[PDB]
């Protein structure tokens, strides 16, 4: 699909590949959310946590959803919209994951859960936009959230709910200005 969808899939592959050459921990040291307030002005970390994945199914499953839902947002709502959904959601989901469990997390699923929230609510309140999420996925999303609450694995439950929430809020606002 779009330039933004694709730029983000290449970033996560490039970072994934570095984690394989350098090791996770080495890459985490630089891209993870600030663990020590001294690092708080290293601004990229509020975002870069999103680019890290820790297995191949981790990256594939995330890029999958990201491709499907992100491309749909870019295709219909434009690249500027997708950028804004990505940035605010990586930041806010990172922020809440950190409060939940500290700064050692990564993945794009926070941004994905925002996308699922946006695509579903926007598709429900403003079907005129031309996106919508099929119920089969809104059930898979729901199963996915709660399957993190019970852990059989190691999910970022603060990221999922925070991202999810962000995507419903952004979608609500956007379906008023419609």
């Amino acid at each position: 699909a779009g330039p933004v969808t694709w730029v983000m899939m290449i970033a996560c592959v490039v970072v994934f590949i570095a984690m394989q050459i350098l090791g996770d921990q080495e890459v985490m040291l630089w891209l993870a959310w600030p663990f020590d307030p001294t690092l708080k002005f290293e601004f990229w970390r509020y975002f870069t946590h999103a680019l890290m994945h820790f297995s191949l199914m981790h990256i594939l499953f995330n890029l999958l959803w990201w491709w499907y839902l992100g491309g749909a947002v870019e295709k219909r709502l434009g690249s500027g919209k997708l950028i804004v959904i990505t940035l605010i959601s990586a930041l806010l989901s990172g922020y809440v994951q950190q409060k939940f469990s500290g700064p050692w997390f990564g993945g794009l699923s926070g941004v994905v859960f925002a996308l699922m929230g946006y695509v579903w609510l926007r598709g429900e309140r403003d079907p005129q936009s031309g996106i919508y999420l099929q119920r089969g996925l809104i059930i898979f999303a729901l199963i996915w959230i709660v399957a993190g609450w019970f852990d059989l694995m190691s999910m970022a439950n603060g990221a999922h709910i925070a991202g999810l929430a962000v995507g419903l809020a952004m979608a609500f606002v956007d379906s008023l200005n419609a």
Partner: peptide, 4 residues
């Protein structure tokens, strides 16, 4: 580590 946790996976978002």
């Amino acid at each position: 580590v946790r996976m978002a």
